[PDB]
């Protein structure tokens, strides 16, 4: 979506690792980068799982990186940064983890979940 994706901080932007030129290309692809893949598709009835505009996908094709990519979300808050002390107690968020915090922020590379506290 943007060749400067890692420098940028983006919201709801999906970067797909693998892209292919279409085997049957058009004049448009001389000016816009082709996104998508030349999937092998069988036009067939297979168990009734692709009815009414459904598709059966190869699980291996998914595992191999087909249409895989990274989705990014931005968290921006404005003001002090720091893990709350136990003295606050009463005002602390109910059931929030409040752990995994270093210097007021979650460290880079940490897997956060619904209950975790970030920033």
């Amino acid at each position: 979506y943007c060749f400067s994706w890692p420098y940028r901080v983006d919201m709801n932007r999906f970067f797909q690792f693998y892209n292919e030129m279409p085997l049957v290309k058009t004049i448009a692809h001389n000016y816009v980068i082709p996104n998508g893949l030349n999937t092998i598709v069988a036009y067939m009835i297979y168990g009734g799982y692709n009815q009414e505009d459904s598709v059966i996908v190869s699980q291996s094709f998914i595992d191999r990186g087909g249409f895989a990519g990274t989705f990014y979300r931005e968290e921006k808050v404005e003001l002090s940064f720091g893990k709350p002390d136990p003295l606050i107690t009463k005002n602390l968020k109910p059931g929030a983890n409040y752990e995994k915090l270093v210097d007021g922020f979650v460290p880079v590379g940490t897997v956060v979940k619904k209950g975790d506290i970030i920033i």
Partner: protein, 359 residues
Amino acid sequence: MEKIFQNVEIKPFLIDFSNLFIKNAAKKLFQLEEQLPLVPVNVVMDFKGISRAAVHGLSRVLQDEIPNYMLDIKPGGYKIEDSTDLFMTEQFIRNRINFIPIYAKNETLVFALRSLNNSCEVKTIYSRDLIQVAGPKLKYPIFNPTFEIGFLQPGKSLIIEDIYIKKGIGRKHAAFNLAVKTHFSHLDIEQYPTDKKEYMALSGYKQSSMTSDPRHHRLGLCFPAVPLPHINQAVRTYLKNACRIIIGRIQSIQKIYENFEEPQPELVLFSMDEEKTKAIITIKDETHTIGNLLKTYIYEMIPDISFVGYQCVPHKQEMVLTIIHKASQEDLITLLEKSIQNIIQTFQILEKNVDELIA
């Protein structure tokens, strides 16, 4: 006596250096003047006097139900430093490394990736840059050195320190997929010339698949990375391992059968009304391989069966096999045991023929 597994053709996929461009490119990139240490090998096997269920079960096992190894990165193994390249994320590189086909005897090998681009342009990381620091030193490489793991922008680094060998089956993750399909045909069914306009819409076989019972099959499977000097040994080991995996799963089902006098969650027996006994066997995480084999051999052993059938619903992740027969519970269990013994004998004969043929 007859050999179920007949002649086999084992032909590796080799680079043609008679092509000037290929030879020049390999020399300029990897200094490669000869074949790679590991090559894909296409194995075309002929089977005679064997059901399609057994041959296709062998194919399915060798595809994605056989235990296999792949290189994975341990948690925390992707070192995030200030100089790490911003495009070679852990997800992209982990996917690249996972699908490098390896031929590993030893599971206790750990590799490291320590690449730093100090030059002024983009540097491509190759599989040769995976240096091994663990276990016994590799007399023969387990993967080829020509894979492009990634590329680094100038001044960027990429450190991956814990690249170990993981075990699994390909139907859980495709990185464990072993064999790709290159051919499947039945040699005892005639075929039309399908270039004709009248036959191009048909499969080609002169018998409907709803009535045909082929016994002579050609199965062609390609294995992606076997050592070049040890092709036949690797192919033999693959085939024997597939046969023994099938035998082991069938023997688990045999244990459930033999324990029928004690109630089991996975086996239910009824006597319905008319001397008919209904046997329902439910095995979690069992696939179409065993279900199809069981149905085929129960049917071959009880031709006058009231009903035999299995369902592997994609959800519920289980195989449910229903047998209805005009016999008592003990007699039905005896017939089912004898059919399972027939399956086991078939695959033991297959293993013996594998040893006899490829050698």
